């Protein structure tokens, strides 16, 4: 018979809950300040909807500290009672039995926003949104304040001052003035403008706006300390790239760096900022746990798995494992490499691209969609110089393996190992 | 006979002196500007009652450099003199013998509350009410400094202006106004407000004016600091959480990653941030020297410990040892892990929850209520396939160990070693 | 026939494109507020133009999502109908068929400015200037608001007190006033100044006031964030000196560090902030991949390498990999090292500058400009004693090797090898 | 015959080069806008002292680029000449040959202030000085600038509002209301403040102001983005304290942590705080380059080097090797560690401090002042339990050693390794 607190029918009726917050939070001061109707009736009903409120509240679901759900509205009702039940309970009983303070009950009806925020929140200009609607509502508040300091007065003062400015000698000036124009002094003495059309005459009046810049003042050094870490939030990146650019050029300096290597430093350096961004993705995918890095390894063998012809066959966690342990050698177009002479345990395939091999003038190797070359591995197994020079060309990304891993992996399964060996085609062996 | 500094009726003295510092300093110069009675023997019990507090700081101890508690109240004698001494003996003479600026007493008074200012704050909340407080004094002193100036001018000066402007024609205004106006005056050119009401006439005026926006401008600039700093140090959370986000995304944007891929990286990122919250607990616990760590391991194995028999009889340092050699493997609800025909050599229990192992859609091990699996390492001890594939099923804690790491350590100890291997009990093999 | 977008006609073309949209949206407001001749001529061709720059997109080729460049005009205006299209359409429009505030196109045509605003920024002074020239904008087109407002009341308006203070009784002042006080007004309720000589009088003006009041403080707070973020991103490197120099002091005062020691180590302290600035070489060293280091390496062996007679006939691979794996070790002038009876496994050369060696008051080994010594490790290769104490002299940088390394990197190498032993030339064995 | 630049009547020379700077800059505009006697003399000898400035700087050395010291003044000469020479020269050059914008060269003199800027700054705080001197200066001008506007539209001008204001109806006011008013407007128009005792009337002193308040706007911005960069310097550090904290308390919190484990985990968080200050000592100390640690490393051995018998003997590489592998184990008074049945690899000794060893109640050990512990290395050798289980005591400071890493640096020595043998002293040797 309970309902669940996930039910849409709740969220609009929170809706309607604010809505109601908002209205009445603004409604109730200018009229009991500034100034029968169906609006008894709806005041009334106000702390009725409440009460059904409580109700709906006791019926609905909660999240406990253990259980997220939990069945039984008789739990609601003994958690939510002695707490948040007071406050709801407060805000949902009139009062009816002037005297307008005593309606604090509208004034504790947003603790409940309060406690309801972080739901109201998705991202940060909500929040600037919402400082903005408590800068309306203390604006009004104190204007209110403001306007009942001055009827008191009055048994030279401001409203005299109001009645010489715009013509209403005195009766007196109209309604609509006398709030316009304590908003507008309260906005005067809030952002520190100091306009001179209104001023306060007597102590009273200065005692208040002494209050008045006070909280002026710490409410907009609130705003700029937001408005600061939002932008610096912002810009964190920007100052980042301008960090490594710091350490690129101060580098570059230190150390002569002749012209045309320093040129390829700083292409190297644009083109890493291009798509890493300075994150290597070397740091988050070491930060996934095991069974992910196998997983997402294995994407990246999208490329050689199904055009190799023995891997079709190969059992998955040899897969995975294999995955773990390729490393697409990423280079940006125009890149030479290893030559004759150097070492050959870095093994070495190709994920796509092209590149070419200048053994002394002779164009080799030509291929990289997704191709193969390399060594023989079970007879030859020598380093030294393999078939020659490799050149620069267009977009350079190949595929590693490395020699010792690769006999240490393979030799763990015996039957896939021998049809690998049986099946080991090579596009172009550099020999 | 020596008192100790500890004592709580020296606390109770100090809030007394504090008490004492503010009431003071803040009726003095109103007294010796603005304007017998009981307040002149207060006065000179003000003196009396500090002289009685240089007794007492003699009589109780003090901290040295070396020494936290010292006894000998010459020692205290000793190093208190040609110091903090002077400055409480002139706050403790009077000089009796009008001229309130000799009056240095007092504002050489609160050179002992910048000595005590660390122990009065606790957290940054008491910062921004001294600074408040340091708002109230510096007005009142300004305020008491307008309203010498005006009556020194006095033989078209702010005076005639506020008899003016308050029904007051000369006689003149009463005492109440000419200070709720100055200090109106204050705070119209401290927060840059510039009210119309009053305003310098003549130079003198004009010149104090401008220091004081001068000093407001510089302590308000002070303000808008302190405030931005709290806000980001409070938000630096929530910009490391954007962060990691970030990250996550890119690298996310970057590779492609499969829709159902990339939604189980990112409810991993989520949940990770749940309870983590950006630190691992790895780096803490690495922070923590030796014997710190073997005692916060042993925290850990309050789960398989008891449950285990032999484990009881097992001595407390290689309890020690091995609690700092099991890792729980932390994974979310639903994950899938190692399948067969990998490595065997990662050997794992279980600590919480439950997990599914289908070899072929055959149900077995359903158990993980501090149970254990595993395989035979006194004969059998081989990689491969142990039982087959892993599934996914609710919150997966396990109990990891190492192969070779379990056999070193337990073949340095024989007699627990053949304890263990003849009490091998396991809940379910997985064969 | 189609044009290509880098053509630099182009750029004068979208310079003339930003000079006309300056102009129209600094014009069209006051002209149409504030107030035949060829300027009626001018506002159609601006439409006109606007059309010709519609027909150049075009002809001119754009950057597609996949192609950096792409031919065919037809695939320009596919992919440039129903978006941007509309915004320079609706730009290039004329209506004529009074009513100014329909002119948007002006208003769109920022918008297309704003899509560029990446292209014309080339470093942060160029944003503040943006937003200098978007407070001008914002103050124009709030003053002409205020004019309007102005205009319309009038069948004790500020007109009135404008005619008041500056003589013009009423006609009505000069048109010239009519707009530097308009603008005079609106900065003073932007930068919260708050002047007396102009003040709302009615409702309307104190309503707009108040919004104007909002729209200063939020853009104001805007600026102060991006000052801020400026000068803390130009102070941060200033702020890492301070922490590392935080760092240094802790330390020697933590562990006595007797006074010529401290001396020492505070003066290596600022020499590395002297050339590294904090910045270790190594890190940015090993960031580079692979090939890049081994290039860069070989700019530092361009002292010993042309110097060293077997070092010419040495092949490519041996100079890239020996350069990759040579150590200079910085030292500053005047620094003592490895004296006898130490390891003698790290193999030691010079680079440049100069050493001194007394084994016991002899002096040896004053060399040092492109020099070598060492021990012979063909036979001896034994640790101990070489020859005996190395003492301070003038610029220190030495050349190291290590013993391990470099047999086993030239053993694989036999022919470079063998040349390399038998022209072993040593300017000085430490013997 | 040449002065060098180090030189302190060069100093001096600079210091009253500054005092000039100030003096004339100050009172030229001052004089040729407000306003014979010895004062023409003196700006004569201005420029008179300034040529002898410039062949001061001829005499006086400078700092070449690759030289630090030159000497042949014609060096300096041909340096200096075009660039700061000209600057100088025409700061040297009077123009006597009104009109006083044309004295440029007191202007262009702050060049060289500028130029000099860095030796005059030592700290922050020089800095803020230094703004305040261009807040006091821009003032200062931009007074001078509206006291001319106001004489040349005398023919409602605001000099009437001043003679109105203070008696004297016109003649006119006297020199020092027409100074004092005009700083007194300068600086209400800057910081926002807004008084109504002056203001503008016509169009040029409107347009003027927003000039003001344009510079004004920028400048505070600037100062409030100094201000807090130096505040976050100076909280960073307890920025950091904090974070560590949380770091701390999230860990605590998330793995239960029993109270008396996380008293003890607070408790030793604080004391390490109490002197690392965050800060490791270890990162520090790799820090340095080789020779530094281990010199560094021997003023740790000024504790057991003096006390133990064989070590005097000892070769100073031998002290450096030695005193580089110990690791002083610094730990909280009141700690238990490794107890019977453990490994006995990890060799130690005592540094200072005490500490018990109670192997089932049997108080031994209660050494550690300069005291010797451990096991026979020579013969026993074997891990296992030595004596039993080390108790709680005073502030404990351990001798952390190795058994393979002293066994191997030893036996490389071996006239000293047999020397240690044989004066082989233990206090009390654990079995």
Not at 75 to 103: E, Q, S
Not at 120 to 127: I, K, L
Not at 266 to 279: D, K, L
Not at 345 to 360: C, K, N, P, Q
């Given at each position: 018979?309970?309902?669940?607190?996930?039910?849409?029918?709740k969220?609009?009726?929170?809706?309607?809950?604010?809505?109601?917050?908002?209205?009445?939070?603004?409604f109730?001061?200018?009229?009991?300040?500034?100034?029968?109707?169906p609006?008894?009736?709806?005041?009334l009903?106000?702390?009725?909807?409440?009460?059904?409120?409580?109700?709906?509240?006791?019926?609905?679901?909660?999240?406990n500290?253990?259980?997220?759900?939990?069945?039984?509205?008789?739990?609601?009702?003994?958690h939510?009672?002695?707490g948040?039940?007071?406050?709801?309970?407060?805000?949902?009983?009139?009062?009816?039995?002037?005297?307008?303070?005593?309606?604090?009950?509208?004034?504790?009806?947003?603790?409940?926003?309060?406690?309801?925020?972080?739901?109201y929140?998705?991202?940060?200009?909500?929040?600037?949104?919402?400082?903005?609607?408590?800068?309306?509502?203390?604006?009004?508040?104190?204007?209110?304040?403001?306007?009942?300091?001055?009827?008191?007065?009055?048994?030279?003062?401001?409203?005299?001052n109001?009645?010489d400015?715009?013509?209403?000698?005195?009766?007196?000036?109209?309604?609509?003035?006398?709030?316009?124009?304590?908003l507008?002094?309260?906005?005067?003495?809030?952002?520190?403008?100091?306009?001179?059309?209104?001023?306060?005459?007597?102590?009273?009046?200065?005692?208040?706006?002494?209050?008045?810049?006070?909280?002026?003042?710490?409410?907009?050094?609130?705003?700029?300390?937001?408005?600061?870490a939002?932008?610096?939030?912002?810009?964190?990146?920007?100052?980042?790239?301008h960090?490594?650019?710091?350490?690129?050029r101060?580098?570059?300096r230190?150390?002569?760096?002749p012209?045309?290597?320093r040129?390829?430093?700083?292409?190297?350096?644009?083109?890493?900022?291009?798509?890493?961004?300075?994150?290597?993705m070397?740091?988050?995918?070491?930060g996934?746990?095991?069974?992910?890095?196998?997983?997402?390894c294995?994407?990246?063998?999208?490329?050689?798995?199904?055009?190799?012809?023995?891997?079709?066959?190969?059992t998955?966690?040899?897969?995975?494992?294999?995955?773990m342990?390729?490393?697409?050698?990423?280079?940006?177009?125009?890149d030479?490499?290893?030559?004759?002479?150097?070492?050959?345990?870095?093994?070495?395939?190709?994920?796509?691209?092209?590149?070419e091999?200048?053994?002394?003038?002779?164009?080799?190797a030509?291929?990289?969609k997704?191709?193969?070359?390399?060594?023989?591995?079970?007879?030859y197994?020598?380093p030294?110089?393999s078939?020659?020079?490799?050149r620069?060309?267009?977009?350079?990304?190949?595929?590693?393996?490395?020699?010792?891993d690769?006999?240490?992996?393979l030799?763990?399964?015996?039957?896939?190992?021998?049809?690998?060996?049986?099946?080991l085609?090579?596009?172009?062996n550099?020999?």
């Amino acid at each position: 018979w309970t309902i669940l607190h996930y039910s849409p029918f709740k969220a609009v009726w929170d809706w309607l809950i604010l809505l109601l917050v908002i209205y009445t939070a603004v409604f109730t001061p200018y009229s009991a300040a500034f100034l029968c109707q169906p609006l008894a009736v709806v005041d009334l009903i106000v702390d009725i909807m409440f009460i059904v409120d409580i109700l709906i509240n006791f019926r609905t679901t909660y999240v406990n500290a253990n259980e997220e759900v939990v069945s039984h509205p008789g739990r609601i009702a003994v958690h939510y009672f002695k707490g948040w039940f007071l406050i709801d309970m407060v805000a949902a009983i009139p009062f009816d039995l002037l005297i307008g303070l005593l309606k604090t009950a509208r004034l504790l009806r947003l603790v409940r926003v309060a406690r309801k925020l972080d739901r109201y929140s998705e991202y940060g200009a909500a929040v600037l949104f919402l400082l903005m609607c408590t800068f309306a509502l203390i604006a009004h508040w104190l204007a209110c304040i403001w306007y009942a300091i001055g009827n008191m007065e009055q048994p030279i003062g401001w409203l005299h001052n109001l009645g010489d400015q715009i013509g209403k000698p005195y009766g007196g000036p109209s309604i609509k003035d006398k709030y316009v124009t304590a908003l507008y002094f309260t906005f005067s003495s809030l952002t520190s403008v100091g306009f001179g059309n209104v001023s306060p005459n007597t102590n009273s009046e200065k005692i208040f706006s002494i209050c008045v810049m006070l909280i002026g003042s710490l409410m907009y050094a609130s705003i700029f300390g937001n408005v600061s870490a939002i932008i610096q939030r912002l810009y964190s990146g920007t100052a980042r790239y301008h960090t490594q650019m710091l350490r690129v050029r101060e580098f570059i300096r230190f150390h002569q760096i002749p012209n045309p290597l320093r040129q390829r430093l700083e292409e190297y350096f644009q083109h890493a900022w291009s798509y890493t961004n300075g994150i290597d993705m070397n740091a988050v995918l070491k930060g996934f746990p095991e069974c992910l890095q196998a997983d997402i390894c294995l994407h990246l063998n999208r490329s050689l798995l199904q055009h190799c012809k023995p891997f079709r066959g190969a059992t998955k966690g040899c897969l995975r494992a294999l995955a773990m342990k390729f490393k697409t050698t990423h280079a940006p177009p125009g890149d030479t490499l290893v030559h004759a002479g150097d070492l050959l345990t870095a093994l070495y395939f190709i994920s796509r691209g092209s590149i070419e091999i200048l053994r002394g003038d002779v164009v080799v190797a030509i291929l990289g969609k997704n191709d193969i070359f390399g060594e023989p591995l079970n007879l030859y197994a020598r380093p030294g110089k393999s078939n020659g020079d490799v050149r620069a060309l267009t977009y350079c990304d190949l595929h590693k393996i490395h020699r010792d891993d690769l006999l240490e992996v393979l030799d763990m399964y015996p039957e896939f190992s021998d049809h690998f060996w049986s099946s080991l085609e090579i596009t172009f062996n550099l020999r």
